[PDB]
Design a protein around this ligand. Structure first.
Ligand code: COH
Ligand code: COH
Ligand SMILES: *[C@@H]1O[C@H](CO)[C@@H](O[C@@H]2O[C@H](CO)[C@@H](O[C@H]3O[C@H](CO)[C@@H](O)[C@H](O)[C@@H]3O)[C@H](O)[C@H]2NC(C)=O)[C@H](O)[C@H]1NC(C)=O
Ligand SMILES: *[C@@H]1O[C@H](CO)[C@@H](O[C@@H]2O[C@H](CO)[C@@H](O[C@H]3O[C@H](CO)[C@@H](O)[C@H](O)[C@@H]3O)[C@H](O)[C@H]2NC(C)=O)[C@H](O)[C@H]1NC(C)=O
Ligand SMILES: *[C@@H]1O[C@H](CO)[C@@H](O[C@H]2O[C@H](CO)[C@@H](O)[C@H](O)[C@H]2NC(C)=O)[C@H](O)[C@H]1NC(C)=O
Ligand SMILES: *[C@H]1O[C@@H](CO)[C@@H](O[C@@H]2O[C@H](CO)[C@@H](O)[C@H](O)[C@H]2NC(C)=O)[C@H](O)[C@H]1NC(C)=O
Ligand SMILES: CCCCC/C=C\C/C=C\C/C=C\C/C=C\CCCC(=O)O
Ligand SMILES: CCCCC/C=C\C/C=C\C/C=C\C/C=C\CCCC(=O)O
Ligand SMILES: CCCCCCCCO[C@@H]1O[C@H](CO)[C@@H](O)[C@H](O)[C@H]1O
Ligand SMILES: *[C@@H]1O[C@H](CO)[C@@H](O)[C@H](O)[C@H]1NC(C)=O
Ligand SMILES: *[C@@H]1O[C@H](CO)[C@@H](O)[C@H](O)[C@H]1NC(C)=O
Lengths: 551, 551
């Protein structure tokens, strides 16, 4: 078998076979040496003695509310802290990207082929004696048994952090610009070739699709007016291909950037809000620049919406998830005297960890109605009937499920949760503990340490035998959550660096783009710098209902 | 007409219209303020006073051989100076890239559409009152007149720097991996989507093409053996599309990575040399890793060849071009504590300035034969008759033509030179002095200052009237050369920053790639770090003939 099956190299050292039975570890720039790169260099000793744990940094940020109140009101210090938040997470992600599902070693093919998701850890070799390498049993536990024992929802568990349905649907809408698995090719492949926040879910992935969605007047996107309200145009009008069941009538087949957004009225809500926003920004730009043509109005509006999106994701969305008392800041300038790569490649593990189906409720509560999954799926009538104002009011009110803590996956989507495990295995993911070490965390020594609890730990020990063969995805869903939090430590420590890179990596955050002239001057720049989830809703939804990401 | 037609913004300020008749300059991070970014900040006023001119720096680097002899032999000093050399340029190229032929303002379409060449300066707006903005006559001079008066070769002018045909054909082969204009779409479009040193001219732009060229045994490329000599395989055997006129014998229809390489036996010489090198690197790696498959052998060899290419381009090719007494070094480690983006986008102006058709001789002298263009074009028969050994010996001995200094473009390729001019105009290039200002050079004040002479200066003045509307491409070919040099100041100052970025930007230069394990261990790594144009020929050409880029 492959000599590297046992994952012998530690601390980011690269394994390489040196014969049928032998390996070598490349220890370059890791700060360690020896056969397995475990012997610390002197300066590394001093850094390991000094640097605080992830769980210490997290306490400070989630406590001392009174001190953060001082810090948040002093611009110099807020900037300084935000700088730290950005740069600490930096060295964790390979940029330029490295491995993918087919390449456990660097190659030009892996670098150059954008159809692949990248990989934070190489896949387990095809010939390894166990699924995880050398440890554990010959087969992993049946995914069905794993799902049923510790993942599936008994009683609904509300998110103690107070996440609402505006948050769950925003998460779904936002992330589906860059998680677009190409099922024709396989789970390690993506159709999101821009690899980040390019708003293709509004504008289309291809220029052909963008042009069918565009009005070609005033920079705008096509739309229709139903009962005085602006909604996306139809499939029959744009000739834009969308995914709908056969029985969905012509008038209810809305056409938007991302082919799947007719699945859920929650997604169509956000699709409508953002289409309105784009056309709203066109109106503003036209006032500032009566001399501009359609193409410049369109392109400039797009850039402004990319900035709004990054702004919102950091300052409302990430802010809410973090539970930090410190006020996060979207300021590209903080990175201007740092080493940082303005480029991104979406990691497969970023997709996997983002399978937050526990967020979904048992029913979808809009006004006085309580819709089942059967009723909610593919029903845009629900949207037209109630209206966007009622959708926002209702979803702002309705609490989401806890993600970590185990047993919170709604039964309606059990097939989807099983697929994340199966697909995880098909893509040959390494173990939870391998991923924890890759992200500077101590491996878990037992299932009890992982769950924080006794009953689930025992199911898992009976299923997996060894903690070092526990899989990443189920673990994220069963993990001991932070105190009163939606997530546990592994989700946060893996998620945040991937997030930082997708957000700050965007070319609009680079010095040559981050100028008022890129956005049509000071007014356009200001739209970016004052954007929020509330203003997005307020500016585009009748009656300006109150909103946020918590109940 | 567009209010930015006159190009009022200086010092890299950005121009933006604010109404039909007004503009605003964006001076962010330029070091200047005021209406056209012409007033220097205090620190800028100081930076200017002290910073040496490019001609001063050029003089220092081409004199004091006795000091450079010391510096070249003290590794620490050599690295310091090279670090300066690499970082002085840097800040001159927009990366992430910005403009293109269709976008004179930043847009997502320009950022993301890899089919375009990028642009160091935005195009002149379509509605400007004169071809170059507002200066000059309503029509530029007839391109045939410019070509005939100041470009076409009367007597052959030899390169006073001693460049040979090994150099000339090296330039053509190397640059045709990234200058691959998509004539189906227009001059501003490329088929080289990898945008740099990917070695697609050897391996193919697409996976379909690569797979047809590969042997699928031991990582190797397919080949044929004619008279005991290894040559590229045929169109018939591989089903690889090549450009050949109908009359070419089947076995002389060689198939290689780049479709136009059958055009010149000169190019097919290097295609054969590099094909040999790849299969040779396979043999070494197979010996090191008898446990590896064909796929890993191929990919690792590819990475090694990319490293070899960059190494040779810096230390032999650029070294020779530069005229420096200082020895340039290929060492990615020098940028690890620097700010630098590991990405590149090929600029249209880099393509334009690289039209060095004056390098070409009047005849091609191999052994005792003198070949005319008509005889040499498409004649791989010449290659087989004489052999690679005689090709190298002959090409090492034959002098190339001077590029600047005027009147040295061979009439055999007059259509190509005319096209360079016509295409510049179709792509709406800004004028020479606009390009000089973009690259930190004083604009030329007269045609006599540009040429250093009187006769061409007078023809150019009668043709163009104003120096401020002189065009880039003809200017590079008539420019007064550096003392006893092949080029003028404008070629070096524009060319060098584009080069750095295309060489150091490559992902193999990034800290996560620049490790022995990336190249299959110390043995792969050392092939890169000891590569030279002499070693390339020595290892792959029968009899190990002496070679170099100068006669
Ligand atoms: C971020 C939170 C989130 C939410 C709230 C959410 C809400 C919902 C929802 C109710 C609104 C339904 C009916 C579904 C149903 C699905 N989801 Co999500 N999904 C979410 C994150 C994801 C992600 C990420 C993927 C992977 C998408 C991809 O790769 O294309 C996904 C994939 C899926 C798939 C395809 C899985 C497969 O077979 O490969 C289905 C079906 N699901 N999801
Ligand atoms: C670098 C020096 C150099 C040399 C030595 C050289 C040597 C020779 C040569 C030798 C016998 C011949 C017959 C030609 C003839 C041509 N060259 Co060059 N070329 C050179 C630099 C270039 C560049 C750069 C282009 C643009 C290619 C593109 O953009 O596709 C080019 C383009 C061309 C074209 C039209 C573009 C196309 O259709 O591909 C012809 C015809 N030529 N050239
Ligand atoms: C990026 O990687 C993709 C996966 O390797 C690759 O897609 C693959 O491309 C090949 C070659 O074009 C396809 O093979 C096809 O052609 C062969 C030989 O003629 C047939 O026998 C096959 O049936 C097939 O039609 C593969 O189908 C395809 N593999 C997939 C989709 O998984 C992309 O081409 C790569 N992208 C780039 C830009 O090179
Ligand atoms: C890269 O940017 C390219 C430059 O615009 C772009 O090429 C253009 O593609 C469009 C749409 O695919 C073509 O326009 C089409 O318009 C109508 C359809 O209603 C047809 O009748 C036309 O024949 C044509 O298909 C343009 O012709 C084409 N422009 C060219 C080739 O110069 C690329 O599509 C962009 N690439 C990406 C990845 O977006
Ligand atoms: C190198 O790291 C590896 C860890 O996998 C070690 O390999 C061995 O570890 C055990 C102790 O010597 C032995 O029982 C095994 O034979 C072997 N492991 C396997 C899976 O074959 C090795 O000890 C480490 N060496 C150093 C210097 O610490
Ligand atoms: C700097 O920017 C330029 C823009 O061109 C300059 O405008 C020009 O002023 C000239 C001197 O009087 C005029 O001859 C000319 O009318 C005008 N150019 C055009 C095309 O309108 C601005 O005056 C100057 N501003 C400052 C403050 O220096
Ligand atoms: C293209 C991908 C980039 C966009 C993704 C953006 C956000 C995804 C959000 C969260 C991922 C998972 C966990 C992060 C939770 C809290 C962050 C605190 C750390 C920080 O303060 O950073
Ligand atoms: C990393 C090396 C780059 C630094 C070079 C520093 C000084 C170079 C001096 C002169 C170079 C001469 C001419 C420039 C014109 C074309 C570039 C050719 C190299 C390439 O095709 O790329
Ligand atoms: C082989 C070159 C063809 C050029 C012929 C047409 C252009 C005439 O051009 C003339 O050429 C003369 C001789 O070099 C010069 O003295 C003149 O300055 C130039 O205008
Ligand atoms: C569709 O949703 C609507 C709400 O307007 C509901 O009345 C109807 O029952 C739903 N149809 C299905 C198939 O569930
Ligand atoms: C082909 O090149 C050969 C030299 O081997 C030469 O004799 C012959 O004239 C060339 N063919 C043409 C069409 O010039």
């Amino acid at each position: 078998h492959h000599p590297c099956c046992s994952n012998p190299c530690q601390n980011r050292g690269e394994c390489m076979s040196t014969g049928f039975d032998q390996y070598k570890c490349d220890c370059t720039r890791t700060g360690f040496y020896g056969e397995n790169c475990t012997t610390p260099e002197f300066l590394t000793r001093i850094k390991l003695l000094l640097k605080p744990t992830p769980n210490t940094v997290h306490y400070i940020l989630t406590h001392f509310k009174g001190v953060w109140n001082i810090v948040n009101n002093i611009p110099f210090l807020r900037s300084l802290i935000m700088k730290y938040v950005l740069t600490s997470r930096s060295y964790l992600i390979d940029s330029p990207p490295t491995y993918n599902v087919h390449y456990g070693y660097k190659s030009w093919e892996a670098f150059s082929n954008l159809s692949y998701y990248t990989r934070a850890l190489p896949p387990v070799a095809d010939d390894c004696p166990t699924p995880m390498g050398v440890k554990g049993n010959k087969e992993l536990p049946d995914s069905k048994e794993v799902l049923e024992k510790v993942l599936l929802r008994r009683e609904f568990i509300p998110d103690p952090q107070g996440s609402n349905m505006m948050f769950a649907f925003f998460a779904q809408h936002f992330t589906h610009q860059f998680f677009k698995t190409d099922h024709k090719r396989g789970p390690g492949f993506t159709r999101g070739l821009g690899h980040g926040v390019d708003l293709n879910h509004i504008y289309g992935e291809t220029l052909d699709r963008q042009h069918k969605l565009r009005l070609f007047k005033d920079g705008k996107l096509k739309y229709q007016v139903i009962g005085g309200e602006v909604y996306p145009p139809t499939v029959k009008d744009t000739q834009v291909e969308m995914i709908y069941p056969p029985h969905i009538p012509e008038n209810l087949q809305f056409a938007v950037g991302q082919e799947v957004f007719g699945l859920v009225p929650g997604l169509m809500m956000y699709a409508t809000i953002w289409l309105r926003e784009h056309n709203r920004v066109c109106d503003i730009l036209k006032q500032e620049h009566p001399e501009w043509g359609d193409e410049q109005l369109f392109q400039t509006s797009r850039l402004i919406l990319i900035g709004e999106t990054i702004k919102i994701v950091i300052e409302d969305y990430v802010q809410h998830l973090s539970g930090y008392h410190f006020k996060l800041k979207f300021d590209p300038e903080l990175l201007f005297n740092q080493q940082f790569q303005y480029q991104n490649r979406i990691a497969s593990e970023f997709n996997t960890l983002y399978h937050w189906h526990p967020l979904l409720p048992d029913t979808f509560n809009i006004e006085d109605q309580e819709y089942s999954f059967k009723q909610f799926l593919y029903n845009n009538s629900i949207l037209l009937e109630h209206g966007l104002t009622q959708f926002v009011e209702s979803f702002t009110r309705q609490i989401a499920g806890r993600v970590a803590g185990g047993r919170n996956v709604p039964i309606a989507v059990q097939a989807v949760a099983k697929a994340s495990i199966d697909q995880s295995r098909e893509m040959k993911y390494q173990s939870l503990n391998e991923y924890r070490k890759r992200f500077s965390l101590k491996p878990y020594t037992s299932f009890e340490e992982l769950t924080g609890e006794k009953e689930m730990a025992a199911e898992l020990k009976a299923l997996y035998s060894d903690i070092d063969v526990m899989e990443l995805y189920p673990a994220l869903l069963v993990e001991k959550p932070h105190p009163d939090a939606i997530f546990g430590e592994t989700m946060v420590e893996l998620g945040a660096p991937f997030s930082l890179k997708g957000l700050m990596g965007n070319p609009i955050c680079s010095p040559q783009y981050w100028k008022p002239s890129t956005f049509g001057g000071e007014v356009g720049f200001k739209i970016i710098n004052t954007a929020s989830i509330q203003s997005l809703i307020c500016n585009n939804v009748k009656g300006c209902p109150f909103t946020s990401f918590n109940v």
